[PDB]
Design a protein around this ligand. Structure first.
Ligand code: CL
Ligand code: MG
Ligand code: MG
Ligand code: MG
Lengths: 369, 369, 92, 92
């Protein structure tokens, strides 16, 4: 097979059958999107005009008044917090993240203080914000949110992620009512969320998405919402946003990735995975069947049961050989203690499925020899 | 010509005859560099293994023990300052940029506190640093640099740029002698410098470049220097470096951009620009000739002088109609008060030189309009 | 006799952020009644062992581990991690 | 009689960072002898008028403009910018 760019650099070939994992490069960009990125990098453009146009084009997908492209969602959090503290004032923009003497408190639920590889407080602290947690990890009430609001409060933060605790937390409507009653901006962290219109329409002033994690874009993010607060976000280009730079190539790459996301939305069906499960089950000691996720989403995976007595290796040994071989094959290892590993086809490119069943046959032969 | 991707987005086609200007997207990336960037964005890779390999490959061009690729030079300054204050300690990385109880002072010359579009202090403050300026704006002595060192000092910063005052300042050797005498890391800001080896050869512990600026790379930067301090730079990935994100596509793009810069560097000689200068001089009221840099640097440009009486327009209006036309043509306007505008061919692509003289011919016809 | 005033004493009670739960009254109110000062470790979804060790200092009084269905389950440190850290720092 | 101990008074002297020059002795020494505290405006290569306006607050005592070949020339604010800003805030 033709070696990819990473094998030519001396690195392993990675077959991602696990998901959008940050340790594997988050996402894989479509070829037609990188063609747009390549053209944008090979030409110059009036940046002031590109920021306005890309913000206009992104606003069509989210339905907001304006948008602003960032380098990532973590950068969007820092810029949105800096926008709420500085209000776009050039004197306060240059002082960030030193917000001493200003209203710099970012009110949020303690159950939303999550870690996605880096603590969300770090991005907030980069914007000059100080954390004010509300409620307990299992319960939060509205009066706790209203009591946390004071004269030093600058913004409210709502985080939407599977990392967050789901039970006992306040709703987005509670944050909208409290923020507007105190004339404060509401920041929403929807990094991995694919719903582009639901959070802007809830009344939030600034909603932050991750282009890479959600839309298979080149490294990019964007803040979307009210025109005045997006203008305060753009004001950080002479401040902290300079260290969080995204170039013209990935700005355009994000726009064409949002187009490539809405068009050709494809999901692998269970009937397409059955021939692969039959091939894996032809291996001695392996049985593969298709399983849908517990929630009921349109997501089907290849659940592979391993019989240690018949194959000679347990599921944990097989998963180690899948990553440890010449080709680094990454699979879901959550049910590994139950003798089960799963294959998520959403991040598996063409022809890589046949490479997975070939590696598994090679693992079985090296267990019976 | 075929409309580029920015024209398909509704923007003007930009012909950059001014230089590596941030308002125009900094640089134009080579097509084969984007081919490697596209292949990297379409495949997954073990990020931790990619960080080690790219640091090794970048170090082959600089001569340092190790390197670390960043999103930009401003991100490199924040990470390098954070590395000097945190020493890679995970708990201290999590607290950044809040260094309330630590040694966080960054000692630098007052004449190096410059503005490159954003104040350099903003990038230092993002790394939790506190500025301690040395000397006056016109003079700085060595005893002033020694006296600024104390227990709260975290690192020394030396900024290499034309923005800095050149006369009366201390050399890089003075910073090396003071830094190593106090066992402190020396950070050198060489963002726009094309010399990959000169500043690691000076004895500095950490040198920062801009990949886009100097090497026509996709949006990227890298810190290069001693292995122990670069290791402290990599520790920021769980902290402030997550907001200053660079993905797998631009890390690979920077490596191939350094290779392309190493296997090329064929510049536009004065004999190549003479056919263009004679074409401009053929227009009435315009006189063009070839000029070299004031400092004898091997850079040749087209010095075009405007006659207000013969042409009917002054040089300021010619430069205004060049930028304001249907094709945005940006030229150097430093000597615009002298009635002269210069054309730098380093950022001009093939065939665009004929488009500049074509617009100049049209400006001459419409001068009577 | 000075309780709950522990102004000049080692009064910090180190615990996980995911274990700061509400069972009708916040668990911090009971900790505060004994003069305790809450020191939260890790995020609400992840808690590493070095975060627990970094929160220990001269003013740390004890380590608290809350066993309840109200607490966050995934990403948290086990009881064995609290016992070993407590033994390494000679704390209850 | 209290000079140069200007504690508790408006004592800040607003000037350009590019004008903080050395003529054999730093200009900050003479300003400190008069009880002033230095508030520098802008960078060494660029200085905008809003930066000069932002340095004016409740503790500002006067504005200083330094005319000398020692100072940086390009990128600095003109004397008229200092005249207008000082007049608008009624400062010497
Ligand atoms: Cl935290
Ligand atoms: Mg079978
Ligand atoms: Mg060290
Ligand atoms: Mg400054």
């Amino acid at each position: 097979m033709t070696p990819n760019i990473y094998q030519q650099l001396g690195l392993k070939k990675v077959i991602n059958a696990c998901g959008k994992m940050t340790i594997l490069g988050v996402s894989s960009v479509a070829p037609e999107v990188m063609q747009a990125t390549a053209r944008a990098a090979s030409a110059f453009v009036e940046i002031d005009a590109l920021v306005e146009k890309t913000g206009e084009l992104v606003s069509r997908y989210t339905g907001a008044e304006d948008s602003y492209i960032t380098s990532c969602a973590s950068a969007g959090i820092a810029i949105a917090v800096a926008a709420a503290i500085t209000h776009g004032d050039r004197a306060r923009v240059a002082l960030m993240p030193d917000s001493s003497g200003m209203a710099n408190e970012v009110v949020m639920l303690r159950g939303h203080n999550v870690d996605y590889g880096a603590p969300v407080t770090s991005a907030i602290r980069l914007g000059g914000g100080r954390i004010v947690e509300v409620g307990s990890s299992n319960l939060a009430t509205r009066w706790q949110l209203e009591s946390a609001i004071n004269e030093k409060t600058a913004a409210l933060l709502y985080v939407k992620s599977h990392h967050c605790v789901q039970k006992g937390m306040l709703s987005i409507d509670d944050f909208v009512q409290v923020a507007q009653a105190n004339h404060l901006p509401l920041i929403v962290d929807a990094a991995a969320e694919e719903d582009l219109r639901g959070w802007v329409a809830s009344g939030a002033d600034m909603v932050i998405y991750s282009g890479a994690k959600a839309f298979n874009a080149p490294t990019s993010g964007f803040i979307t919402g009210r025109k005045t607060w997006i203008a305060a976000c753009k004001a950080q280009h002479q401040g902290i946003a300079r260290a969080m730079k995204i170039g013209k190539e990935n700005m355009v790459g994000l726009v064409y990735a949002l187009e490539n996301y809405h068009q050709g939305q494809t999901t692998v069906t269970a009937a397409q995975l059955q021939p692969v499960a039959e091939a894996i089950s032809a291996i001695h000691g392996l049985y593969a069947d298709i399983e849908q996720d517990e929630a009921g989403r349109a997501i089907w995976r290849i659940r592979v049961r391993v019989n240690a007595s018949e194959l000679g290796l347990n599921a944990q040994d097989v998963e180690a050989q899948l990553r440890g071989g010449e080709i680094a094959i990454y699979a879901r290892k959550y049910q590994l203690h139950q003798g089960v590993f799963s294959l998520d086809p959403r991040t598996v490119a063409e022809g890589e499925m046949a490479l997975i069943v070939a590696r598994l046959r090679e693992i079985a032969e090296h267990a019976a020899d």
